[PDB]
Design a protein around this ligand. Structure first.
Ligand SMILES: [Ca+2]
Ligand SMILES: [Ca+2]
Ligand SMILES: [Ca+2]
Ligand SMILES: [Ca+2]
Ligand SMILES: [Ca+2]
Lengths: 212, 189, 189, 189, 212
């Protein structure tokens, strides 16, 4: 055919609309995952509960994805206790959630029981929780569920301002998981494992390297 | 079949599952022939090898009341850091954890094989190419150089720290490989 | 057939078979394009190469009264020790040996085929992957680094120490390879 | 296929399209391997060659307001006079003219190939026989002798004389050929 | 209707693809024609044959077209002898083709007969060849056919390098027609005419003024 006589424009707009396509470019992105939280450490001297900040950057794998978004909203967050001790082991594991950073960490059973999301279990009970981490059946699992309803959209951070008014911390920290041992062993030990079954929604992308 | 290629299925004791009372670090085992005396006797007669199976099964030998679990996973890059805890383990390839006292049912894997309630850590062999049989590992070099000879590393970790260093079980490897170009066993390094 | 790929069949003089009057060690030749002037002139225009054939023929040119024989084999791991004697040579891949004055019948192998009475040492090329074409070898490095660029080494040895260093015949390479990604010949290292 | 015949598809920068501010003469380029460094590195390893494609595409790199056009055609006889103007060009084989600033769409021809709005000058290769690979041109001889080695000459002309000598684009050759009887690259002249 | 608001481009490519259209612009062009070659000159002193270079520039009309192309390939080339003498005229015309410029021109019948394309005829035979020049019927014509099969694509030239190695001449000269008289008349004469019935293919156009 005839060679086409192209008309050359002074320019030609180069335009892109919206976050460049890829795995985490959608306005929002829902994510469900099982994440090892920590060892159930049993102090032999302290009766104080151990605290765990329920925020994305504390979940290595989830964090990898979460740092690509600026906002997140927890939908599930459930911590399962997996026993790794015989049925001869005395003691109990106590768990509850603290929804205000300003609130004091429970130092004993009574305090723990009076706190939201409270749960206790024979340190050797709950192995069936292993099946929770995969399929389901929380029938015989030791789980501490965090109240996620009513939790709004939180900014995704890579840190927690700890030496700051608890009120500013609250703006980023939906809740803290408080884990306590009902008794003091003669020597520190680790009766089981704590795995988190988190479900959240990420929103509004951001270059990971900028996210803090 | 043939033409400078001999297939081989072996079973050998790999090592004792050792639990440290101080370190939380995993113990790594290089998935290479020279780490298995008998298999080495065979493999050292060849220049090249290619793993086809490589599975490490844990067989316990302790009371059912002992505390703790055994954690296993494979590290496919020498540059990758050795897991110092359960999550790191649970997050990597081939992950598997089981109470330290559980596993005996795995003896059937050794003789024959009906892995059901067996505690095995399988290595990703598909897409693992022909590597050169060596007698050692150049640890003092760039991890990338090591990768050249190390298909993978088995990472074994004690979920907890016993009050005293101990070994509640043993790791046995069920390897399947093909060997290729002959060499004098004594010149193979 | 296409898109960064075309087969190349070549024949070139590799080196003289030199017999040391004092050393019993085998001489080693790196099987890479840059050790073959003409082939190099072609391969250097590409970034990657993959040997499909690589056969080295021994063609004699001495009297039927010369004693001793030539021994050849291939070494597929730079780390492997070079055969010091007949037994060692005989135990390695591609091993072939022949009276130093025999082998002239293998000249039609250079043009055509019929390795029927030839003295050829064939390198195992099947399962040899794409290797980057290089203008040299890092001889002072970990063998594993070298193995990255060196598919194999041809080891040639004399089963006898002549009274004086001499060359009973020559080695000719019959290589067949495929080249892949274009590169300026002058920029290829 | 094979038997002293290696097919080759290459892409190489041929030359800068140069516009003279004084001469109206076309610049001619000899369509032979030694004019393309990389291709030469390959072709010089063979005694004979036979062009199958040989296409020269013009890729511009100037403002769309620059004045002038590029003219191209092929001269199949060395005796034939080099075109000194547009008509002479428009009247000969493979003629093609396009505004000096037009052509960028031709980059697709380089990688892959979908010549549409590409500015190419194709040489008549059909019925071009096996020529001898040479390292030079005997210009000082009867044009008929030259024809023996020169399949054709590409003629490139600036439709106009810029006020200053300049180069608004570059010519890249997309050659396809078959090479035949090997020779030592260093002895090929 | 509404005046159209033309958008003016910085430029507008001016392009032409391929040899400008016209009578001899095709990649190739086949041509058949009858061309007067020469008089059958009969020397009264020399026995040597006369040579004729079978190349386009020696055919005035054909050359007009042929110079517009750079390559040609003979397909037919047949030289017909037309007698213009009575049946009382003694002598014969001998014709053959020489395919190597280095080859010696035949000086006698034996030599001529041993040469490719050989043919002889009573100088007064062959008038029926007149009908060949138009329709056909070479039944009773004196024709010398040149071996054209296997003749490749030759460069079109406007000259022959004569004081040059016969091998370079061969590159441009497919063949030479050798015409000889079987006898020497008492005085030079012209018994007939030689017409060429050429058929060739031209290829790859070129400005005529450049063609040499
Ligand atoms: Ca942030
Ligand atoms: Ca080795
Ligand atoms: Ca390179
Ligand atoms: Ca040459
Ligand atoms: Ca000409």
């Amino acid at each position: 055919a005839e060679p086409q006589l192209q008309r050359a424009p002074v320019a030609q707009a180069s335009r892109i609309s919206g976050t460049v396509p890829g795995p985490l470019s959608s306005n929002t992105w829902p994510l469900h995952s099982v994440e090892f939280l920590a060892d159930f450490k049993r102090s032999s001297t302290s009766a104080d509960a151990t605290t765990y900040d329920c925020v994305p950057f504390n979940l290595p794998r989830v964090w990898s994805l979460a740092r690509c978004y600026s906002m997140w909203k927890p939908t599930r967050w459930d911590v399962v206790y997996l026993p790794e001790v015989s049925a001869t082991v005395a003691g109990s594991i106590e768990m509850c959630f603290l929804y205000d950073y300003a609130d004091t960490i429970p130092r004993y059973t009574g305090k723990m029981s009076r706190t939201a999301g409270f749960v206790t279990s024979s340190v050797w009970y709950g192995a069936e929780g292993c099946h929770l981490l995969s399929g389901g059946s929380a029938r015989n699992a030791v789980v501490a569920s965090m109240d996620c309803s009513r939790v709004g959209w939180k900014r995704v951070t890579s840190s927690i301002p700890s030496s700051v008014d608890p009120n500013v911390v609250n703006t980023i920290l939906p809740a803290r998981l408080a884990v306590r041992s009902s008794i003091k062993p003669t020597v520190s030990d680790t009766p089981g494992k704590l795995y988190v079954i988190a479900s959240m929604v990420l929103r509004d992308p951001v270059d990971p390297t900028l996210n803090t």
